[PDB]
Structure formats: structure tokens, C-alpha cells
Amino acid sequence: RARSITLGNSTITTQECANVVVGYGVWPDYLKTAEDQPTQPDVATCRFYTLDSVQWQKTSPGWWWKLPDALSNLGLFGQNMQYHYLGRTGYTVHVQCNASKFHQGCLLVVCVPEAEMGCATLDNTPSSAELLGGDSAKEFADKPVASGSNKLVQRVVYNAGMGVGVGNLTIFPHQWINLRTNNSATIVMPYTNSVPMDNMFRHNNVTLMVIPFVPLDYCPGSTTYVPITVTIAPMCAEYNGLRLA
Amino acid sequence: PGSCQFLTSDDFQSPSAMPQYDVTPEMRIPGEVKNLMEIAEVDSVVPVQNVGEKVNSMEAYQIPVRSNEGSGTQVFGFPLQPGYSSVFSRTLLGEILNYYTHWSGSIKLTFMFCGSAMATGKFLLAYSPPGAGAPTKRVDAMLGTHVVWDVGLQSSCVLCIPWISQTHYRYVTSDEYTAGGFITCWYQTNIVVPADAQSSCYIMCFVSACNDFSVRLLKDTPFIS
Amino acid sequence: PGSCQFLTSDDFQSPSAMPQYDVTPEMRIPGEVKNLMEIAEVDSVVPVQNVGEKVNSMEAYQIPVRSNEGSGTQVFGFPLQPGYSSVFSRTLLGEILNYYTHWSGSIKLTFMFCGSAMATGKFLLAYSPPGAGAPTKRVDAMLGTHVVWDVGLQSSCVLCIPWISQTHYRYVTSDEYTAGGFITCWYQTNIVVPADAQSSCYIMCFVSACNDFSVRLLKDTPFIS
Amino acid sequence: SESTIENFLCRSACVYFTEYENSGAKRYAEWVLTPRQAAQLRRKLEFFTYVRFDLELTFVITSTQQPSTTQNQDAQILTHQIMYVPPGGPVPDKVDSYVWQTSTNPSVFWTEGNAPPRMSIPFLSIGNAYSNFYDGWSEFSRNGVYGINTLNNMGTLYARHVNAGSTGPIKSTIRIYFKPKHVKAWIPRPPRLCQYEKAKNVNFQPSGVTTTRQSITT
Amino acid sequence: SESTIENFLCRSACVYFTEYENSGAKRYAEWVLTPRQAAQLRRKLEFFTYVRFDLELTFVITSTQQPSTTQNQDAQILTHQIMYVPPGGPVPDKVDSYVWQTSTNPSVFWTEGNAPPRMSIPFLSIGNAYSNFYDGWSEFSRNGVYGINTLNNMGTLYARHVNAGSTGPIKSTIRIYFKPKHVKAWIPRPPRLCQYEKAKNVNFQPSGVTTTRQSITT
């Protein structure tokens, strides 16, 4: 049997058992300086924003979506980021994947905080175009990016673009997806940052990475892809007060 | 004797360069690390197939399983020393253990069969005691501390190997360690798949730690050049 | 390590050069300063019209208001950073704030219309939020945090702008600060005077501080050459 | 017990070595406080995202007699001045500048032949924690460089010779030791794996996952 | 908290630098105690009308070997004497005078190579507070200069070489640090705005009120 979770206008279908993964044992609650720093909360912003689906094929390295940037163009969240300046928010990823019993694979859904990416050329830093992809996921690469006089972000799948071992990414809140057992993944991310409030257009709070460790395999005749689908809901988001004390 | 000398490892009180300056109070940031042992207790994917160009790719982690030509053939095998060993020296556990000169404890191993929901087989995970050598055949492996793992019923098998300790000083690289055990996998039965289902499937391994783990005499990391 | 060294910022006990000498007892002199914040809470006239030779005169302080050619035209405007800003860097508030590297708090602004007792008009004092740019027209200003100030009824209007903090390190001079708000004045209505009464009148501004003001990391003053 | 962060990140590490003279073009030293130059300490610090700590600086100053041909020498005792410029403070453009006298820069005078000079710097962030990793731009405009928050500024360190001791040339070397204190760390992250290239960025060259072996059954 | 006058007017500021030798015309230093010479500290003191405080004087004495051609040198350790002449006290006319021996002038002898010498002077006014600003004449008669009260006299400071160390020439520089203590301030007054000219008067050159801008709507 399935379930339905209605947040505002949106409604989404989920399994009775969802095994939610709270980020660091902390639920994304509100903020606990009077007139000097007034703050105003926004509620309607909370709702289920469904991003474009991505086709998972046999030759598919991985994907990455910056959580503040991805919704920077959709509904109130896209608007509020343009109007208010300082804002703090928490998230609830809902990576769902549908494939038959005759498909086989494995995916790692990991929420990485402060994922500072590397650059092909050691001398310079990556351009925001090759770093930020709006209304569309950014893909990894199998072979290393050719270095030269360019600002291409390093995108090899094994180094993960942060220059670490991709087998150790488990340290961060994560969840595996075995196409023979688990079919979805839920991760609740609290607000992780040095400051109580930060500018949302100049700093990405969390990064969502989905990398297939085991390649998708199927027999000739089955559907030749698997449509991974991501749903993001901003949680307990508050912004600065534009009033006058 | 022992005064008016600068010792790098000493704990004394120092005169503050800038006094009368109010430091910012602390806030609640999620996920505060108290001890390094907690990090070493998160399961990390283990590159079992670090053979040739497999390391410079993503197939190093996945272990290939083929139904054909496996009546009783070995699937994989590696010694049981975390730090100093090609298969475990780069995991989280191994990276924490490459900082200390003396470490003893127990290791947890988790295997996850990643294949179709319609594939069934059996495997024979055997644990060789430290002094004893790796088993030559499937029978030798059975006459020991084995675990028959059926992938139709359970999709994941967990082990808890004890008697794991430092085997050498500084840093050494060696296959078949004398004072360390060996974990090997044997094809008890072959992979049985129906029509229109891939019979080639892969496994994955995750190494963790346990409550009974000690680490002493911190030193320099050998991975820095 | 850390002894037999002279550190300029240290608090130790010193041997008195002249002991056995009775210092004169203290008396009651009026107006004892306890903290520098009290000084920063006295309203100071703000040179809004620091344009050209206006600074080297007395007309820098006064703001000129003309009834003619002001159906909806802007009267004045300036960013909201006290220290480091031509309009506020020389007031009492700005002079205290140019000693500290980190300061946050709220600013009080008072406008006093200085004209005949027979002149009536309206003004539209608008406050732009930090990120938002200064308003282009009177409508843009109205669709925000405005205060319609009628000079017939009230002769003085007071504001209390919050979210005021340090925007740069060291010392910078810049018009239109990115992380600071803008205060602008618009002619809602024109100055209506009877016969035998001057229609050209002036305004004045007074900047103060508030109870919620902090100042840390004292440094050198940049006005000394 | 030895794995607590207080016992893991509180080791006196040498982070800078230079030399200044009483004569010639080189006459003073400077070093912007930054902990990313020594890779042995950088790799340990990069196990966590946000770290909050205090610094205990120890300086080892040794002077050697430079080879020369100046006759009739008879040196006096050398006195050094180490001026620590706090964030947002004036910095000297030359040795005999008027910035060495400013009162808000806590300089320490030390006379040759005693216990080494040492001063402690408190948490200097205007925020609540230093950020080892930053996933943003320094400025809202495109001009701002990527991954360089202006909130991890620990200041700068200038050293010089208060007086020229003798008439001959003398070269003095200064070694700086970094000892973090009261260390709190949040959000642990995976080790480097790759080698370091620069001190300003996380740029790297793609490398293998681990070292190879003869076979999977070996 | 950092804005209390105790945290605003208690910074070690260098207020005097000179040099004296063991041979030649220059043989001693002198400096009438007065806090109006360093503009960085004068401008802070001039925020209040009457200030009452105590003084902690720190002297940094360093000796360099002057270039010379005297052969067969072998210096001994140098000893300096810093004599602080209290208000209304005898002052030396030469180095080898008989005023250096007087017992009411608290001189301090310091041998080269130790911690710097330091002495504390108490409130020396015969009145109840030092007057930063005076709106009167020093004397009832026209002879009295304007704005110079004779009640802010903090004394004078003389330094010399107790003995000539070697047979060669040596020049010793003395830096004086001013640290006010127990500071009480009354009647706050506006900042300087104009630049300083002399140390004895408030004379100034008329200047603008502030810096200019393009327009009133800018």
C-alpha cells in the first residue's frame, strides 16, 4: 500500500515504510537581535517542488543539484530569494526511482554540505556557468577533464569533483537504493552554516549528489532507462524583516 | 635542569596578545565531533577489485560475479589488516588507523548483493584464523568458520571479525600477512536467473569499526608526499 | 617560553617610582563619562549638502527645499552606513565608529523643517531595504517602507532604521553601498505659503544611536595624517 | 583517548621559516596568518567543515654572522620586534616606517638569549566558526573569487631588528609554530586522497582510488 | 564593553625616540613629560575636558656599535641610568653633573640584556584633575601665555650611560611607552576634525566640514 503527503497545494505518493534519514539527528527547526536585527518567517514557501526527471542509462556517471540554486526560479522560493536578502532554510529530499523487477543497479543519494568543487586548470577557479545549473541537473564524467586554459569544473566521478575517495562519501547523510530492495530515499537536512542567516544567491548551503556505484543492467526488450525523479521541499525558512523599528 | 628550554609538546599558559576583546559566543551547529572513533564507525565502500586499470575508474568497488564456470571456484579474497593494506588502507577506517602506531579491536564487514530481484544463488564466506593460511578449496573453507549466504532470502550478509591488531611498525605493504586472517568467498551454487534477466551481477563491501577499538601513539600520515 | 619578553598589550604590576606620596583625593566634577556609547547617543547635525564649495561654508548642513518644480521630484538621498560615508563619517556617531572594526546596531534619524509658521506641505521619506536599490520614482518609494510627513501639523519627523552593520574592513569611500539601505525624500505636495511669506525653506537632519549598539576590535583613526 | 580532537589537533607544527638582515635589501619578514600552507596540518584540519579554535604562536629567532670583510667588529645584543597586525589594521611598507609604532598592533620586543617569545590570539571571526570549505563567491558581483570567504582573516605577522647590533652583516632566521587550543569541530568530511597543489584553492589532479594488487583472489 | 574609557585609553603608545652616545657632543637625553606630542594619543585624550590618570613608563634601550677605526676593542656590559625628575626638582646641565646623585630623583639603573626597565608615576597634580583645555592665562599679568595652566606639570626624564663600555664609540637609542591607568574622564567634547600643528597650542588651519559628493541625490 502507498501513502499521500499533502504539503500546501502539492501532494506526493510514498511507501508506508519510508525509512527517513534525519541529517545529523536534528530536525530543521526555527531560530531560537530584537529590534536591531528583525526577522520575519515565510510559510507558503514550504511545498513539494518536483524537479525535471533524469534518465538513468547504462553509461551514466552521475548527477549533482545545488539545493538553493535548483529552486532559484521556481515559485515563491525563487521570488523570495530576489526580494529578501538574508535567509536560512532546511530541506527534505525525496529521490524516487521506478524500475521493474528485471532491472538491476545501485545508487548513492548523498547530501554534501559546502561541496567546493575543483577546477581542471590548477591556476584558476571554475566559472559559475559550469558550476551552477538552473532548472537542470549537472552530470559527472567518466574520464578526467582535459586541463588547459579553461574554467571547466573537475567532474571525474571517482574523485567526485571535491578531490576525495568516492567510497568515503558515506560520512555525510546518505541513503542507498538497491533496485532489488529499496525504491526511494528521503533525507531531511537541517540548516548547516557558520552564520544564523546568509545570502542565498552568493552561497550554496547543501549539494545533492546521486551517483550509480553499480551500472544499470537489463535484458534486450526492457525499457532502456530508469527515470530518477527528485522532489525538494524548503523547511522552516525565515528571511530578514524589511520593516522599520 | 629542565627550565628555560622550548619543548614542542608542552602545555603552559601563554600571555594573550589581544586582551579586553569579547569573542563571539558559540551557536548550535549540527553534527559536533567529540572523538575520531565515531568517524571510523561509518561503513565505507571497499575497493576489492583494485586490479590494474580498475582503480582509475568506478569498477574498482564492484566485485564481478558470473554464473558460468563457478561450480566451486573462489569469487574474491583479501587479508584482514585495515591500515597498511591496498584494499582497506584508503577507507575511512584505514585513513584513521594510518595516524596511530598501535591499534586493536574488531572489524564489521557487510556484503550487499546488487543484482536482479529474480536471481538466486549461494555463497560460502569463510574466515581463516590469523596463523592459518587462506583455504585452497571449497571443502577446506567449509571445515572452518564459514557462513552460507543465500541471496534469494537475504540481500545482505554481515560479519564481525575479532582479533584485529597492528601487525608491523611504521608502514609496510604485503599480500598474505602472517599474523592476520583472510576473508574468501566461494560459489556454493551458481546464479539461477529466469528468462529475460541478466545473470551477470555484482557485489559490494562496506568496512566499519566496533565499540571495542583502541588507538594509541599518534604519528605522521604516509600518504602525504 | 613566553617570559622575559615585552608585549605592548599586557597588564602587570609596576614598581612605583615615587612611593610614600599622598595623591589629592577626588572631587565631584559634573558629567563623568563611563562609556563611549553615551557620547554616540547625542543627536548631531548631518551635512547632507556636502556638494562642492558647500562643505567650506555653513550651508553644507541646511537642505534647500523649493516649492517650484517639485511635483514629485526627489529632495535628497544618501546611503545608510554611518562610518566610512561622506554624509555621516564626521558626525559624533561616525567619529566613534571610525575607531572600531566591527559595529552593529540601529540608527535614529530626526528631520526638522525650518521654515515659516505659515508654510504647509507634505514629504515622502522612504527606507530601501539593504539589497534593494534606491527608488527611481515617487511610486516606487511609496510601495515600500515610507512615512508621509506633513509639516503643517508636525514640525519634526523621527525614524529608527535597523539592520545597520559594518560593510567593509579597514576604510572604504563609496556611493550606493551594496549591503546598506538608502534614505530618500520626495515632494508629495508643494510648499503652500500665503502672501508676504518666503516659500524657499530649509530642512536639517540629526543622527543618533540606540540601546542595541555594539562596537568591537578597536583600531587606529584614519582622519590623522 | 588519544583520538579526542583536543589530542588530535593540538600539536606544535612549524608553519613558516624566513630570514631578515640588519643591512641590505631584505630587512623584515611578513606572513599573512593562514593555516593552509603546511600540508601535514592542513590535511588534519580538513577532516571537518567548521572548526573554532585559539592560537598559541611560538617564534624561534636565531642570528648567524654573515661572511663579510668589515674589520674591528664587537657586536652588542640584538633586540627583535614581532608586530602582529590584527584584522583590518595598518601594515608597514618598509622597515623604518611609522606603522611599527602604532599602539593597536600588539608587538613584542625580545632580547637575544632568553626563552623564545610567545603570544596567544583569541577567536578572531566576526561569525561563529571558521569555514575550512566555502561553496560561494567572496563578493556578490562576478569580480568575487570562488571559495574564499572573507571571514577566516586571522591577520598578519611582521618581524624586524629593533637595532643594528654590530658594524658587520648579520642574518636572523624566524621559525613560527602553530598550536590550536580549545578546538571544536563540526560536520566531519572524507580525507584528501589526492595530493595538494596550491594553498588558495581545492584544485587537484584526478588520481586512482587506491594502490593495485596482482588479482582479486590474491 | 570595549568602549569603556579603561579599554579606550589604556594602550601602550610610543611617545618619544632619541639616541645618546658614550663619546662626543651628544651624551644624554631629556624629555619634559607631556602627552601632546603623539597625535594618535592626543586626539583620544582630547575627547574629554578633565582627565585624571596614573602613568606606567616602559623604556626600550638598544645600543649599536657606531662605525669607527679604534683597534683592539673588547666591550663590557653597558649600564644605563634613567633619572625621573619630579615636578619642582633639580635638572642636570651636563652628563657628569652633581644632580645625577640627588636622592629625591628616583633614578633606575638597568644592565644591558634583561627585561626592559619600568616605573609607575602617580597623579602629580596639586589640583583635582589634569585640564586638557585651559581658557585662561598662565599668570595674572600680561606676561602669562594663554591656555597653559601650570598644574599639568608631570616632570622631566633624563637618561645616560653610567659607564663607557669599550674604547670604541657606541650609540644607544631609548623608546618611551605611555600607558595611562585608572583613567577617569569628565565633560566629553567634540573630535578634532582639523589637523594638529604645534604641541603647545590648539592653533589650526580652517578646513571643510566633510568630504564632498557628486550631488544631494547621489
UniProtKB/Swiss-Prot annotation, chains D, E:
User: Where is this gene product found?
Assistant: Virion; Host cytoplasm
N-terminal signal peptide: none
Share what the entry says about its subunit structure, partners included: Interacts with capsid protein VP0, and capsid protein VP3 to form heterotrimeric protomers. Five protomers subsequently associate to form pentamers which serve as building blocks for the capsid. Interacts with capsid protein VP2, capsid protein VP3 and capsid protein VP4 following cleavage of capsid protein VP0. Interacts with host CD55. Interacts with host CXADR.
What's this chain's function? Answer: Forms an icosahedral capsid of pseudo T=3 symmetry with capsid proteins VP2 and VP3. The capsid is 300 Angstroms in diameter, composed of 60 copies of each capsid protein and enclosing the viral positive strand RNA genome. Capsid protein VP1 mainly forms the vertices of the capsid. Capsid protein VP1 interacts with host CD55 and CXADR to provide virion attachment to target host cells. This attachment induces virion internalization. Tyrosine kinases are probably involved in the entry process. After binding to its receptor, the capsid undergoes conformational changes.
Name by which UniProt lists this protein? Capsid protein VP1
What species does this protein belong to?
Coxsackievirus B3 (strain Nancy)
Full-protein residues shown: 630 to 847 of 2185
